[PDB]
Design a protein around this motif. Structure first.
Motif, PDB file in Angstrom:
ATOM      1  N   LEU A   1    -105.347 -27.259  -0.022  1.00 29.28           N
ATOM      2  CA  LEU A   1    -106.584 -26.566  -0.365  1.00 29.28           C
ATOM      3  C   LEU A   1    -106.346 -25.502  -1.430  1.00 29.28           C
ATOM      4  CD1 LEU A   1    -109.543 -25.887   0.065  1.00 29.28           C
ATOM      5  CD2 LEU A   1    -108.907 -24.467   2.043  1.00 29.28           C
TER       6      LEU A   1
ATOM      7  N   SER B   1     -99.234 -28.763  10.820  1.00 33.09           N
ATOM      8  CA  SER B   1    -100.590 -29.151  10.483  1.00 33.09           C
ATOM      9  C   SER B   1    -101.574 -28.316  11.283  1.00 33.09           C
ATOM     10  CB  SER B   1    -100.824 -30.630  10.784  1.00 33.09           C
ATOM     11  OG  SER B   1    -102.203 -30.941  10.723  1.00 33.09           O
ATOM     12  N   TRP B   2    -102.730 -28.038  10.671  1.00 29.50           N
ATOM     13  CA  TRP B   2    -103.834 -27.446  11.419  1.00 29.50           C
ATOM     14  C   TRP B   2    -104.183 -28.287  12.637  1.00 29.50           C
ATOM     15  CZ3 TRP B   2    -107.359 -26.527   6.561  1.00 29.50           C
ATOM     16  CH2 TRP B   2    -106.949 -25.343   5.923  1.00 29.50           C
ATOM     17  N   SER B   3    -103.900 -29.588  12.589  1.00 33.84           N
ATOM     18  CA  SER B   3    -104.207 -30.453  13.718  1.00 33.84           C
ATOM     19  C   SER B   3    -103.230 -30.285  14.878  1.00 33.84           C
ATOM     20  CB  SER B   3    -104.244 -31.911  13.257  1.00 33.84           C
ATOM     21  OG  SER B   3    -102.941 -32.386  13.029  1.00 33.84           O
TER      22      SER B   3
ATOM     23  N   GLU C   1    -102.294 -28.654   5.038  1.00 32.73           N
ATOM     24  CA  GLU C   1    -103.676 -28.676   4.555  1.00 32.73           C
ATOM     25  C   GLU C   1    -104.012 -27.411   3.772  1.00 32.73           C
ATOM     26  OE1 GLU C   1    -102.979 -28.875   7.936  1.00 32.73           O
ATOM     27  OE2 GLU C   1    -103.152 -31.041   8.268  1.00 32.73           O
TER      28      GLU C   1
ATOM     29  N   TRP D   1     -99.604 -30.592  15.008  1.00 27.91           N
ATOM     30  CA  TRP D   1     -98.245 -31.128  15.029  1.00 27.91           C
ATOM     31  C   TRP D   1     -97.356 -30.381  14.044  1.00 27.91           C
ATOM     32  CZ3 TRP D   1     -97.072 -32.839  10.122  1.00 27.91           C
ATOM     33  CH2 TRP D   1     -98.116 -33.334   9.322  1.00 27.91           C
TER      34      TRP D   1
ATOM     35  N   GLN E   1    -107.777 -32.939  23.467  1.00 23.78           N
ATOM     36  CA  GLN E   1    -107.352 -33.457  22.172  1.00 23.78           C
ATOM     37  C   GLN E   1    -105.874 -33.162  21.968  1.00 23.78           C
ATOM     38  OE1 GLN E   1    -110.260 -33.315  18.871  1.00 23.78           O
ATOM     39  NE2 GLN E   1    -108.607 -32.603  17.502  1.00 23.78           N
TER      40      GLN E   1
ATOM     41  N   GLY F   1    -102.573 -33.783  16.332  1.00 21.82           N
ATOM     42  CA  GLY F   1    -102.851 -34.904  15.464  1.00 21.82           C
ATOM     43  C   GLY F   1    -104.225 -35.514  15.622  1.00 21.82           C
ATOM     44  N   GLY F   2    -104.988 -35.127  16.653  1.00 25.20           N
ATOM     45  CA  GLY F   2    -106.394 -35.474  16.730  1.00 25.20           C
ATOM     46  C   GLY F   2    -106.783 -36.454  17.821  1.00 25.20           C
TER      47      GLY F   2
HETATM   48  C1  HTG Z   1    -108.577 -28.805   2.516  1.00 20.15           C
HETATM   49  C2  HTG Z   1    -109.139 -29.239   3.854  1.00 20.15           C
HETATM   50  C3  HTG Z   1    -108.617 -30.625   4.202  1.00 20.15           C
HETATM   51  C4  HTG Z   1    -109.322 -31.200   5.425  1.00 20.15           C
HETATM   52  C5  HTG Z   1    -108.405 -31.110   6.637  1.00 20.15           C
HETATM   53  C6  HTG Z   1    -108.724 -32.187   7.660  1.00 20.15           C
HETATM   54  C7  HTG Z   1    -108.244 -31.765   9.048  1.00 20.15           C
HETATM   55  S1  HTG Z   1    -106.493 -31.748   9.175  1.00 20.15           S
HETATM   56  C8  HTG Z   1    -106.006 -33.389   9.723  1.00 20.15           C
HETATM   57  O1  HTG Z   1    -106.567 -33.659  11.019  1.00 20.15           O
HETATM   58  C9  HTG Z   1    -106.328 -34.969  11.531  1.00 20.15           C
HETATM   59  C10 HTG Z   1    -107.050 -35.154  12.878  1.00 20.15           C
HETATM   60  O2  HTG Z   1    -106.723 -34.143  13.853  1.00 20.15           O
HETATM   61  C11 HTG Z   1    -104.825 -35.162  11.686  1.00 20.15           C
HETATM   62  O3  HTG Z   1    -104.566 -36.468  12.225  1.00 20.15           O
HETATM   63  C12 HTG Z   1    -104.115 -34.966  10.347  1.00 20.15           C
HETATM   64  O4  HTG Z   1    -102.702 -35.041  10.584  1.00 20.15           O
HETATM   65  C13 HTG Z   1    -104.485 -33.612   9.730  1.00 20.15           C
HETATM   66  O5  HTG Z   1    -103.971 -33.533   8.391  1.00 20.15           O
END
Ligand code: HTG
Ligand code: CLA
Ligand code: CLA
Ligand code: LMG
Ligand code: HEC
Ligand code: BCR
Ligand code: HTG
Ligand code: HTG
Ligand code: HTG
Ligand code: HTG
Ligand code: CA
Ligand code: CA
Lengths: 56, 137, 244, 56, 56, 97
Positions: free
Chosen positions: A40, A16-18, A36, A20, C107, C110-111
């Motif tokens: 997109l 994930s971009w986040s 993501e 993990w 952070q 996962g956020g």
């Molecule tokens: C096409 C763009 C979609 C928008 C993407 C949103 C950010 S990405 C999003 O971030 C969250 C918070 O860090 C994570 O908990 C989650 O796993 C992750 O999918």
């Protein structure tokens, strides 16, 4: 109850971009082709195909 | 209600003498207080140090006492901290520091009496509003 | 060669501790009859690690990396205090004052955001015995205080606080109070942290030392609303030692 | 001020409370007038006032 | 009306507990703001019991 | 049981007198001669095991001791409360007018 997540993982999309990954790692950078980015890309493709359908 | 001689009668010194200000003195006192003091003391508070106000009860517990004409006139010549321990003319307007607080340069002894009378009369009119701050606006 | 504020402003250098050359491998003699102080202690964190909260107690939780989101606002600096020579020849630094705390939010993957009060407030840190000179083998180890990340006036988004604010959930006038007690009754945390300072460079002539540090402490508990996380902070430090 | 609360009639008849949290809790309910025990569980009641058929 | 009845009970020699215990629960319940029809909300839907609960 | 420690302290002598171990410094304006010179010394040299220990502050002049003696009746001491003394709150507790 995840249905498309395993299909992304099967062919190499694991992060994930986040930050993990589905293998449980932290601080990995998947580049653009995260879950993501895949989502997109499919939304944009959908729009472009919709516009092409209008033209044809 | 009226601005009577009784309202305009305030303590002259700590020994029980009073002085009765004229209406012209009261008006002069309001004008001079706005001119020299209200930028920090509007409404009887102190903007640059809100812990100390101009309420008569506060002035009475100052050292030396400031709840009378003589005490207030002396304060405008040689201001002190609340315990009288330090002279603060270098950071508070006074005749002694009229060189660095130029608005004090033209204040006469008569003017200081009017400013003092204003500080003592105004809570007799406004009550808790004087020194009360925004809570009482 | 001496930089001004206008040289530094906006570069990020203001959040960095001074460094010493690679030639600074000397020794700073301690006169047991002289009194000393640290005129400037600077701590520049480079990594914030947070211990994960695992579901399995048999599983040993690890400290994982995090992303800093509050920018170059993290370093402790201008810290001073007494440097005592103890009877056994060890030295003890007793922190007196300085910019000795920074709120920091990192952070997790996962956020999840982890606020903490990165600090060495009331640090007392000591070397090994018989330190006749400060060298690259000298280490400091000690404890410090970690007060609540928010102080007592802080009001939550529904106006509740400890030294101020409402004492109930006023938007739910007839809800049962028991389930809301942990959110309604604010509590002020005070815990201990631990730190190690590893000296890596010494300028014997100037009394300056530099090296790496590692500290461990708890993160914000939101005035008692939830459990804090364990944080490990790593970075570099600088200190100037002077006869006092 | 050492505020206490004593109840007369009702469930709590004859009882007196002196611990500040409990006294404060009853004072908060007293701004609503007379104080009642409610079942908030049966309907998953949310604690927020609603109007009656007269209002609606 | 509640106060009038309590005062009449005291004047007839009742104790304080007896005077208040003589108040009908139904009368005390009217003297509670949760039954005031001007305490609701346009989108706070349903019965009054959904808010403060079912009075017991 | 969860307790608001500030509300709790208001039920002790802290809610009745100037607590030399806890009270914010502006409270010393209530009585003649305490602010700001003694008030600063008192807060700096806190905490105190008893009210009379305030007379042992090193460097007090004889007049300062007299003033403290006349005001011991207005002082108390309770346990230091972290929530009241952190944040520099004894010097500025966020209250103005
Ligand atoms: C096409 C763009 C979609 C928008 C993407 C949103 C950010 S990405 C999003 O971030 C969250 C918070 O860090 C994570 O908990 C989650 O796993 C992750 O999918
Ligand atoms: C443009 C390129 C492209 C790329 C790189 C991807 C990539 C992806 N897609 Mg997307 N997709 C695309 C276009 C694309 N898609 C288009 C145009 C559509 C609309 C049709 C979709 C609709 C779509 C859906 C509904 C899903 C995906 C999914 C996915 C992911 C899993 C793919 C998978 O398992 O396929 C499996 C592919 C096959 C098994 C191919 C079968 C081929 C048959 C057997 C061919 C038989 C005919 C052939 C001519 C016979 C002769 C062959 C000859 C060699 C002998 C992966 C990220 C999955 C996902 O994870 O979504 C988030 C998913 O559920 N895609
Ligand atoms: C005079 C009409 C009227 C009144 C005063 C009541 C009163 C009541 N009803 Mg009854 N009801 C009615 C008609 C009425 N009902 C009708 C016609 C039906 C069949 C649908 C029902 C079915 C019904 C059920 C199933 C229930 C009730 C319940 C109740 C109670 C709760 C009411 C509530 O929460 O409303 C909430 C009111 C609103 C949220 C207001 C809606 C405002 C609308 C959306 C505005 C729309 C604006 C419009 C689109 C703008 C267009 C502008 C354009 C021109 C540009 C209350 C005693 C409840 C109860 O407690 O039962 C015991 C309950 O469960 N009623
Ligand atoms: C084809 C048929 C038409 C189908 C339309 C479907 C309805 C769509 C629009 C819904 C509008 C109402 C939504 C309310 C939300 C809700 O869930 O309510 C839910 C409520 C019921 O409320 C429920 O009650 C339950 C117990 O029975 C529980 O307590 C629930 O918690 C509670 O929500 O429904 C009603 O009360 C309906 C009656 C409302 C009466 C309104 C009277 C005043 C209206 C005047 C408006 C005039 C405006 C003119 C403007 C021009
Ligand atoms: C701000 C720039 C001010 C102006 C202009 C004036 N005053 Fe002031 N005042 C100011 C401060 C910061 C203080 C407290 C100083 C301290 O450290 O103790 C004061 C105090 C007074 C007092 C004493 C109040 C008390 O309760 O004892 C008086 C009587 C007073 N100030 C009067 C006064 C007059 C008459 C002024 C105009 C001529 C005036 N002040 C200007 C801040 C400022
Ligand atoms: C190569 C590559 C890839 C892929 C790609 C793709 C898949 C693409 C596609 C693309 C597309 C898919 C495109 C499309 C386009 C479209 C268009 C261009 C359209 C247009 C339209 C129009 C112009 C129309 C108009 C109109 C309307 C809208 C309405 C009506 C009228 C009319 C008709 C006029 C990837 C990513 C993998 C990466 C690698 C590289
Ligand atoms: C339309 C949105 C386009 C966003 C483009 C973001 C590219 S981001 C870029 O991409 C590379 C290829 O995956 C990675 O290798 C690299 O690490 C990453 O930073
Ligand atoms: C339509 C606009 C949305 C564009 C979003 C681009 C995300 S781009 C993505 O971001 C990650 C950091 O969050 C990086 O790890 C990764 O290398 C980068 O490619
Ligand atoms: C001697 S010091 C002196 O203090 C005076 C006020 O007392 C000022 O008028 C003056 O400018 C200041 O320098
Ligand atoms: C001792 C403090 C807790 C008991 C007294 C608090 C007020 S009384 C309390 O209030 C709740 C909200 O109205 C009701 O749901 C409940 O039935 C009632 O017992
Ligand atoms: Ca080393
Ligand atoms: Ca519920």
């Amino acid at each position: 109850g995840m249905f498309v997540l395993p299909f992304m993982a099967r062919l190499g999309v694991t992060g994930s971009w986040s930050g993990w990954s589905i293998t449980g790692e932290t601080g990995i950078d998947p580049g653009f082709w995260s879950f993501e980015g895949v989502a997109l890309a499919h939304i944009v493709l959908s729009g472009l195909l919709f516009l092409a359908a209008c033209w044809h | 209600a009226e601005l009577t001689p009784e309202v305009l009668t305030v303590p002259l010194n700590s020994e029980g003498k009073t002085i009765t200000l004229t209406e012209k003195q009261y008006l002069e006192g309001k004008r001079l207080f706005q001119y020299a003091c209200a930028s920090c003391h509007v409404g009887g508070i102190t903007k640059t140090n809100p812990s100390l106000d101009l309420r008569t009860e506060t002035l009475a517990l100052a050292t030396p006492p400031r709840d009378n004409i003589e005490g207030l006139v002396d304060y405008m010549k040689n201001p002190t901290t609340y315990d009288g321990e330090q002279e603060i003319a270098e950071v508070h307007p006074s005749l002694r520091s009229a060189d660095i607080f130029p608005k004090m340069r033209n204040l006469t002894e008569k003017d200081l009496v009017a400013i003092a009378g204003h500080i003592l009369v105004e809570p007799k009119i406004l009550g808790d509003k004087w020194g009360g701050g925004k809570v009482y606006y | 060669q001496t930089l001004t504020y206008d040289d530094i402003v906006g570069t990020g250098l203001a959040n960095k501790c001074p460094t010493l050359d690679d030639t600074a491998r000397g020794a700073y003699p301690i006169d047991s009859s002289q009194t000393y102080r640290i005129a400037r202690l600077c701590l520049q964190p480079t990594t914030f690690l947070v211990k994960e909260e695992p579901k399995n107690k048999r599983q040993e939780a690890e400290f994982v990396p995090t992303k800093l989101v509050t920018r170059e606002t993290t370093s402790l600096d201008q810290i001073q205090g007494e440097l005592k020579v103890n009877s056994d020849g060890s030295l003890t630094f007793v922190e007196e004052d300085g910019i000795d705390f920074q709120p920091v939010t990192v952070q997790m993957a996962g956020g999840e955001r982890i606020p903490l009060l990165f600090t060495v407030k009331n640090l007392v840190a000591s070397t090994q015995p018989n330190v006749t000179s400060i060298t690259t083998s000298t280490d400091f180890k000690g404890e410090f205080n970690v007060p609540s990340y928010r102080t007592a006036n802080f009001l939550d988004p529904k106006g509740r606080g400890l030294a101020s604010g409402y004492d109930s959930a006023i938007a739910l006038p007839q809800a049962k109070e028991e389930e809301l007690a942990r959110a309604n009754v604010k509590r002020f945390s005070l815990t201990k942290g631990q730190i190690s300072l590893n000296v890596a460079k010494v300028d014997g002539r100037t009394g300056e030392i530099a090296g790496t540090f590692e500290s461990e402490q708890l993160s914000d508990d939101d005035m008692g609303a939830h459990e804090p996380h364990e944080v490990k902070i790593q970075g570099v430090f600088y200190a100037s030692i002077e006869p006092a | 001020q050492g505020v206490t609360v004593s109840f007369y009639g009702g469930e709590l008849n004859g009882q007196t409370f002196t611990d500040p949290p409990t006294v404060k809790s009853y004072a908060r309910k007293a701004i609503f007038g007379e104080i009642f025990e409610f079942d908030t569980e049966t309907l998953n009641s949310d604690g927020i006032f609603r109007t009656s058929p007269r209002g609606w | 009306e509640i106060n009038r009845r309590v005062q009449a009970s005291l004047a007839s020699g009742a104790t304080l507990e007896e005077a208040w215990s003589a108040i009908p629960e139904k009368l005390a319940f009217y003297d509670y703001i949760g039954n005031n029809p001007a305490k609701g909300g346009l989108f706070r839907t349903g019965p009054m019991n959904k808010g403060d609960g079912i009075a017991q | 049981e969860l307790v608001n420690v500030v509300d709790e302290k208001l039920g002790t002598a802290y809610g009745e007198k100037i607590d030399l171990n806890n009270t914010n410094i502006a409270a010393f304006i209530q009585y003649r001669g305490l602010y700001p010179t003694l008030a600063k010394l008192i807060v700096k040299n806190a905490p105190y095991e008893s009210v009379e220990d305030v007379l042992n502050i090193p460097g007090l002049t004889e007049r300062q001791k007299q003033i403290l003696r006349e005001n011991l009746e207005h002082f108390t001491v309770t346990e230091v409360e972290t929530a009241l003394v952190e944040g520099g709150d004894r010097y500025n507790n966020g209250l103005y007018k």
